């Protein structure tokens, strides 16, 4: 079927190569897993050696890491906004490695508000319904309050991430291969990489 | 050829088996095991061709199925079991013990050992790796992995294994001045003191070895097996004490034996 052999190719001198054997099983290839965004659908592939490849066809949840805070959470994949290889991949919303994706920011905001006791991504209406007023102010002993005040001194987020948190969606890069492991994991974009991809996305539209 | 090969042509068998040409087309084809195919002695070859305890392969099978043969203290009923260097073969029914030691001409000699010496063996260490919550592990040339080895034990060293328990009792470090046997190449079977080891990074390391008669020879590092600490071996050596006679002195010795005979 699909082949990955090097002998059907021309020689470096440009001459044709005449095949000396027919297609072998160990040179096979398989159709691409154009993973989409949707309710989870994963198929398994029996591969060489009897092992197993997980072929993700639809995914809607990933495991993404906030590196600057070392906060890894399972979030919901929302949309595909950039692909460095092809534009049709963005047009068809295909999850591949190194694709830029919008992920839900709720778990990260929850962790931030529970770890720093400072609001994140909030509007100025200051609703602060109960069980959030408690998580943000609470009452603590002197030692606990002192520890939180010590934390607050080095809790400052970059403005770009703050804007994204206001919108409720963060930009992330997929570092996994959904068509091989059945998982869409990655890291939240920040720093100069975030600026680069923001400029690229704006210039694309 | 799809899949692994299961036969061995007689003329394609390793030459140190000393197999003839007219007995058959095939050779015993050693089973997969602790020793490589080219560097092993199958049980059938030893039990039939060497010791003459059996006349045919079926007799070797009949011998082994009564559970008389033990290789390193464990009963082995596979007639093509690969027994290799420093292995101990015990037959309790007749009460003898052999150690597979290379002869001077690169062949496994029939070397009988005392039952006291059949309780241990020497193993070259092939690699050391840490795994599974920082537990060190040793791998020997006999494909046995030993966890919690002495931290001094490094690669290319020799460890004395108690066959009954499988634990290390002592070791010899690979260093100049230690006695060694050559387990491969042109000098296979030769015994001598290590003189110098020259390192070639990214390539093979060459070890120089001097005999007890003053002769010197080189080998690759992978062909060196530390036998003893200093000049004294930790095992018993075969009748030829590891020194190689030239064809001239071999002929002279044979002629002297002929003259003294009768």
């Amino acid at each position: 079927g699909i082949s990955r052999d090097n002998w059907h190719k021309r020689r470096k001198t440009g001459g044709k190569r005449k095949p000396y054997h027919k297609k072998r099983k160990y040179e096979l290839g398989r159709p691409a897993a154009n993973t989409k965004i949707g309710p989870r659908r994963i198929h398994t592939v029996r591969v060489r050696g009897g092992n197993k490849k997980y072929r993700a066809l639809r995914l809607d949840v990933g495991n993404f890491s906030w590196g600057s805070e070392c906060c890894t959470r399972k979030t919901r994949i929302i949309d595909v906004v950039y692909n460095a290889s092809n534009n049709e991949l963005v047009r068809t919303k295909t999850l591949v490695k190194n694709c830029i994706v919008l992920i839900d920011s709720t778990p990260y905001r929850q962790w931030y508000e529970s770890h720093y006791a400072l609001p994140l991504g909030r509007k100025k209406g200051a609703k602060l319904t109960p069980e959030e007023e408690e998580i943000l102010n609470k009452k603590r002993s002197k030692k606990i309050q002192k520890k939180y005040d010590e934390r607050k001194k080095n809790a400052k987020i970059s403005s770009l991430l703050e804007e994204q948190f206001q919108q409720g969606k963060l930009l992330a890069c997929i570092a996994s291969r959904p068509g091989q492991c059945g998982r869409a994991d990655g890291y939240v974009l920040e720093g100069k990489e975030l600026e680069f991809y923001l400029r690229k996305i704006k210039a694309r539209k | 050829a799809r899949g692994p090969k299961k036969h061995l042509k007689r003329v394609a068998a390793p030459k140190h088996w000393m197999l003839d040409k007219l007995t058959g087309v095939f050779a015993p084809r050693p089973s997969t095991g602790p020793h490589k195919l080219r560097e092993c002695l199958p049980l059938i070859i030893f039990l039939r061709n060497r010791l003459k305890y059996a006349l045919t392969g079926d007799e070797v099978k009949k011998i082994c199925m009564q559970r008389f043969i033990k290789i390193d203290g464990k009963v082995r009923t596979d007639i093509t079991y690969p027994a290799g260097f420093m292995d101990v073969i015990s037959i309790d029914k007749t009460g003898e013990n052999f150690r597979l030691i290379y002869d001077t001409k690169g062949r496994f000699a029939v070397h009988r050992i005392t039952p006291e010496e059949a309780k241990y063996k020497l193993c070259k260490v092939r690699k050391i790796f840490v795994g599974t919550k920082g537990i060190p592990h040793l791998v020997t040339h006999d494909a046995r992995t030993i966890r919690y080895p002495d931290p001094l034990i490094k690669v290319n060293d020799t460890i004395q294994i108690d066959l009954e328990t499988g634990k290390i009792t002592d070791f010899i470090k690979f260093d100049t001045g230690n006695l060694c046997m050559v387990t491969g190449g042109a000098n296979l079977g030769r015994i001598g003191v290590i003189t110098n080891r020259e390192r070639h990074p990214g390539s093979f390391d060459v070890v120089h070895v001097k005999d007890a008669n003053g002769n010197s020879f080189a080998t690759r590092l992978s062909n060196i097996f530390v036998i003893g600490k200093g000049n004294k071996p930790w095992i018993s050596l075969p009748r030829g004490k590891g020194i190689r006679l030239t064809i001239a002195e071999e002929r002279d010795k044979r002629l002297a034996a002929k003259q003294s005979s009768g």
């Binding site: 090097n6 470096k12 600057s68 805070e69 460095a84 400052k156 720093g191 990489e193 680069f196 | 990214g202």
Partner: protein
């Protein structure tokens, strides 16, 4: 020298560049740490690779490649591809019927790192074997020595 010229973001994968920094330690930029490795076999790491900013995943000093096997030498003949050059190896092949040699050559496409600048047509390059980097490239330039009459 801008190093972002592709659709994707170029970055050394081992280095983490988003470590949190307090404003008290914001003296310009943090001077992004550089990943580099010492390839063995007595080859020195060029100072350019250590103090550079180029991104080259095929670089023997800052990329993911292992030097192993054969180490060869050649003369640079062409430098018209991106980050890879064509060198020439000349030798004499013996013919036993006549007891005489004949001059032969073969070209080799070898990857050249951005750490070797001012490479001219004619200098000697010591290259080392690595894993396949492209269809025809299996070697990486490890050392550059100038021609006999350079300025």
């Amino acid at each position: 020298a801008d190093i972002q010229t592709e659709r994707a973001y170029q970055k050394q994968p081992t280095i983490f560049q988003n470590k949190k920094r307090v404003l008290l330690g914001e003296t310009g930029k943090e001077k992004l740490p550089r990943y580099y490795k010492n390839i063995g076999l007595g080859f020195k790491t060029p100072k350019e690779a250590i103090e550079g900013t180029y991104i080259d995943k095929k670089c023997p000093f800052t990329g993911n490649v292992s030097i192993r096997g054969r180490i060869l030498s050649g003369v640079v003949t062409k430098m018209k591809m991106q980050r890879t050059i064509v060198i020439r190896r000349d030798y004499l092949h013996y013919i036993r019927k006549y007891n005489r040699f004949e001059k032969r050559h073969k070209n080799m496409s070898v990857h050249l790192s951005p750490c070797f600048r001012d490479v001219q047509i004619g200098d000697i390059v010591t290259v080392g074997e690595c894993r396949p980097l492209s269809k025809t490239v299996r070697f990486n330039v490890l050392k550059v020595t100038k021609a006999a009459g350079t300025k």
